[PDB]
Design a protein around this ligand. Structure first.
Ligand code: ZN
Lengths: 364, 140, 63
RNA sequence: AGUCGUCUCGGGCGAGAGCCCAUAUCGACCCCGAGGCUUGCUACCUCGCUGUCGGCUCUUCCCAUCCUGGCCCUGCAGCAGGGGCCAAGGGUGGGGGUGUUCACCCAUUAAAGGGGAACGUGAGCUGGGUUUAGACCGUCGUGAGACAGGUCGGAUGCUAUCUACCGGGGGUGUUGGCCGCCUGAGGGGAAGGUGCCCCUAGUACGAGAGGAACAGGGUGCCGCGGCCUCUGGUCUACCGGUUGUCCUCCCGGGCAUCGCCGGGCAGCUACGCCGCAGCCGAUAAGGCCUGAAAGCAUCUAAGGCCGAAGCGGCCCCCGAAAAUAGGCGGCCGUCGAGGGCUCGGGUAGAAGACCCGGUUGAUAGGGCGGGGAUGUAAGCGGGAAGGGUCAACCGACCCGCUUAGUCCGCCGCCCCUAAUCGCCCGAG
RNA sequence: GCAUGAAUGGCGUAACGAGGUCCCCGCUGUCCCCGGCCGGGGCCCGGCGAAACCUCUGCCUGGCGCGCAUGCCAGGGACC
RNA sequence: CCGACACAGGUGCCCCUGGGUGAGAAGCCUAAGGCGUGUCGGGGGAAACCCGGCCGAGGGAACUCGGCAAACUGGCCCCGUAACUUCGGGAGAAGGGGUGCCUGCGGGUGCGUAACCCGCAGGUCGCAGUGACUAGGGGGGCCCGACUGUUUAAUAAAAA
RNA sequence: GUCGAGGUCCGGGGCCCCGAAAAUGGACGGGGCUCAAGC
């Protein structure tokens, strides 16, 4: 070795291909004792900044500091399915699942357009935009009979885990009509208690305030912004070639030695950049709002939406979370959050900090 | 606690941008004898391939004297940067900037070799080095 | 949580923005934007711009 | 390529030096080896062409380990040194002269380790040296001329046929077709590495000088993955100033790099900002327990306990073609679920692909309102250094109507316009 | 003075030079460290439409071998 | 026309050229005359990358064999100008100040309030007045050849 | 000097052990084999 430098880029995020699905997946879940749904979903709204009295350990403890925040709007999720998992030869297997029958929709923002009355939406009509093949002639009696069978299997003991299937409600915030379907794990150490929790919440609405705790750490999962095909200089951060180079400057010099007589997979190359599945850890939850307003001192409440609205986004109308820092994805992207799977030994107290200013000035 | 009052170093909550690389010319702001110095290295800093060492407000650098009294020229000394032209952020989120790149010549321990400092001294530098702050007349 | 006042347009700007310029003679100026800083340093007269608070003082000055 | 005289490295005996003491450290004379990282020797392949040294870019590997982790002996009081062992996950930088490799030197640093890959890498680059054709100097030759002696100048060709790697798509198969959510065989990762500061503490140690460690707190630098609230750059959308010329003059415009200059939101960016667990399991050197062979002794022979930045898991990324080619709920078939093209647009984009909307309507346009960028429009009225018959009129420029005018690749409300008509696979 | 030398001239020299070489001010994207924008290619669609080159083929690790193998030996992978 | 071509070369640019700005047959704009045949078109935030341009915060050669490329200066008026020297020069050395538009006067040649040129005072706007176009970066040592000039058409322009 | 059965040495023979460090991942031909599937 003559001169040594660290490799350009990381090999731990390969292949750098387009994400399999625009809806992020969660491979691992935190281990908790409290019986609650482990995470939530929302749509990216924008970014602002606040001034607060710092409380986490450090030199700047008890001092007013600047902190950027990302606001993400979180209309309540509809809990409409329960799924059971048994243990297979190589891993977990889906024993069965059951979903509630169709019900009228009481939160669709219908407007009385001239001619014809209000549309009178119902569930299984917003859901067919995602599933496209839903049960026919499905009734409460058979739904209850299926739920009883699932409970009987749980009692027999072949069910090792249970998860809740939920769907988003973009029509509430008037972002879109096609919902997004996910399944979330539940905390606790008893499958029967987890099943009872899910059963009690079947067919109902669930809000961030009922699951997440203000001031706790989270992990954010989403699909980053797309950049298209990019050269190695931007994709892996290689060094530009000498200015006298007559065959270009934004390319790798040599793509390998004589032996092995092949191009190695570790040589930087052009390709897809952005629109990748990524996870960021230890993002603090600063505050949870309600109806687009934030309560600061129990006497003055301010509207989180900046003057003129969020750029490229509408007006926040439902519950929202204020995450400290930046999150992957573009505006309107679906973003999922889970309780921190890997928190530090010393972490900030679980409570909203003291906020002294919130930036609501025009951001465009 | 060791050296309650005789300590020559402190800590600061703000980290100014490293806007002054190797080869930059700094104006000497004290009466130690030097007038202009050139950065030839930054202490307590590890670089990488083809990367020049950079320093900001409150950083100690190794410099060679270019202008000054005959007994100071062509001498390698230690300096502490007290003012820089590149704006840097503070705790409140506001950016602070100065008018010129100015430094004060000090011993490696951190005891200034002069007795007077001209112009304002950045609060970050004053906090980082107690003696510089003690001798400073204007601190902002 | 204090709204600094720009030294050129004489208007307040929100916390977390703007910048402070320190002169060698010891005085400090506050600038709410690069536009204001550049106009101040080039020397454009703020008393002739209706969007600055100095224009009101100039109007009172003339009558 | 073969060989290893030579080179790098290691071992055997122990004269001798070490206040006594061969082995803390050195190890004469002599003897036995490893590597193929220096040079040499041979002439085995290549002269119907395998394009040189150095440098830049980029990838990878070995340990005979420079720093980082853990230990043993000491002529180890502490702080440090000398020698050796385990350990290749990470780091090993910036500059001066010289073409230089190298060596020398400078300031930092934990350290600024040596090497293999056709002396890695010219269908990647550069061309400073070597090595043509021109010329000068020294020496040699009667001369033409020569010099592993100096010096100035002296060209670097390419439309990828196969394979390889990077990303993007259409298919068949998976014992009928379709949609939706999942599992996770197997692969990849460094996703982390490393300094300094406070306290322990002027404490242990030491005559003094000097001067630690476990534990507990803070923070910098290098590396990695994201984002545009703040700051900075750009911003051939946009607004303003102004020069030459042309449209006769006024307004308003063409060209002169966007004519030039200042500012500039959205977007993209870094010089900006945010995020990156220390805990379990088994081990290497080493430290021990029980214990005989060998009535004692003994860490080893059988047996057992602790013990590393190293190894495996937790963590992150890809992942039903995973040939044991998966699970589940639903829908259809034995006319028909479910699709493709076509339509209005981007959370996307080289073609494909992907996402939202499509009268169960706010997808785009238009209207209105909000928020922005420039910076006060044209027109009219008054003043203006003066001149003019001191009259009419001319006059750069200034003040008021005027936070004006212009513009918006941002947001909200309103179905006013277009998201229509239509065409084709499709299991049996 | 290995191995300078006076007309194959010796020494010096103002002015001159797209000659060779060293240093200083100023300047700057040469560099720290690269980022935006513009026009033309590249890309897609409708046309006209070749050439260089070509034994047949064409995945790898250790090897035997005219001593540096896509094709041989033993293994590992590979749906088109 | 010659070069195999409806070749970006050569022969022939061989002779000639309104207006404005301007020293100018310079650059830019424009009248006359000519052309849309330096002859394949259409689409697009439709990328990476390559060629030709514009700008880049802080530092300012730390890059490199070497400041290669780019950048600084730039027209005109006034002041001022070194070592050396072959007395001719060096020299536009170096370095410093000014430059727009508007309102009025003075001056030179002139019969003239024709035309061209030269000063003076005052008012006034901008970040910037040779505002675009045009338009030198400078200094100090050493070697070689005195200078202008010529040379390997097709890798050497040099001290030959 | 009390126990109370073989002790203490020397030179040899067979197998094995230490001495024993390399660069793309990999070589007993491979799987693998321990009263052998070794000698
Ligand atoms: Zn201002």
């Amino acid at each position: 070795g003559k001169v040594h430098r660290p490799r350009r880029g990381s090999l731990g995020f390969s292949p750098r291909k387009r994400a399999k699905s625009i809806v992020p997946r969660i491979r691992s879940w935190p281990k908790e004792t409290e019986v609650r749904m482990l995470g939530f979903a929302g749509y990216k709204a924008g970014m602002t900044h606040i001034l607060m009295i710092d409380d986490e350990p450090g030199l700047t403890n008890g001092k007013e500091i600047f902190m950027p925040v990302t606001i993400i709007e979180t209309p309540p999720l509809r809990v409409f399915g329960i799924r059971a998992y048994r243990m297979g030869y190589l891993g977990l297997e889906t024993a069965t699942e059951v979903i509630v029958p169709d019900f009228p929709l009481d939160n669709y923002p219908a407007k009385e357009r001239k001619g014809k009355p209000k549309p009178k939406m119902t569930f299984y009509k917003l859901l067919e935009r995602r599933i496209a093949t839903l049960p026919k002639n499905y009734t409460q009696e058979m739904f209850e009979q299926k739920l009883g069978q699932l409970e009987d299997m749980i009692k027999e003991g072949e069910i090792v885990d249970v998860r809740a299937i939920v769907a988003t409600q973009p029509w509430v915030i008037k972002l879109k009509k096609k919902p997004e379907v996910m399944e979330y794990a539940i905390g606790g150490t008893s499958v029967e208690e987890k099943f009872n929790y899910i059963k009690e919440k079947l067919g109902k609405e669930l809000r961030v305030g009922e699951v997440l705790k203000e001031g706790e750490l989270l992990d954010v999962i989403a699909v980053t912004k797309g950049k298209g095909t990019q050269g190695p200089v931007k994709r892996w951060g290689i060094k530009l070639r000498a200015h006298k180079d007559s065959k270009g400057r934004r390319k790798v010099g040599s793509i390998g030695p004589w032996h092995p007589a092949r191009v190695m997979w570790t040589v930087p190359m052009a390709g897809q950049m952005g629109f990748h599945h990524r996870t960021e850890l230890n993002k603090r939850l600063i505050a949870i709002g309600e109806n687009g307003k934030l309560k600061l001192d129990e006497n003055t409440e301010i509207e989180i939406t900046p003057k003129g609205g969020f750029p490229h986004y509408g007006i926040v109308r439902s519950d929202f979370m204020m995450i400290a820092g930046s999150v992957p994805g573009a505006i309107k992207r679906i973003i999922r959050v889970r309780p921190a799977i890997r928190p530090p030994k010393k972490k900030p107290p679980v409570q909203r900090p003291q906020i002294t200013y919130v930036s609501v000035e025009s951001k465009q | 606690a060791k050296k309650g009052a005789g300590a020559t170093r402190g800590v600061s909550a703000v980290r100014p941008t490293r806007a002054l690389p190797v080869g930059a010319y700094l104006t000497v702001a004290d009466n130690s004898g030097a007038k202009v110095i050139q950065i030839i290295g930054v202490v307590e800093y590890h670089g990488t391939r083809r990367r020049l060492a950079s320093a900001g407000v409150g950083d100690m650098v190794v410099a060679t004297v270019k202008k000054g009294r005959p007994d100071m020229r062509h001498q390698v000394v230690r300096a502490v940067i007290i003012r820089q032209r590149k704006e840097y952020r503070r705790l409140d989120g506001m950016r602070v900037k100065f008018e010129d790149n100015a430094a004060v010549i000090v011993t490696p321990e951190g005891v200034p070799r002069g007795t007077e400092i001209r112009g304002p001294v950045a609060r970050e530098a004053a906090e980082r080095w107690v003696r510089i702050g003690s001798i400073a007349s204007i601190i902002v | 949580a204090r709204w600094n006042v720009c030294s050129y347009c004489g208007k307040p700007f929100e916390p977390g923005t703007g910048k402070m310029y320190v002169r060698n003679d010891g005085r400090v100026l506050f600038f709410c934007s690069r536009k204001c800083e550049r106009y101040y340093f080039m020397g454009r007269n703020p008393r002739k711009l209706k969007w600055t608070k100095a224009y009101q003082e100039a109007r009172l000055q003339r009558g």
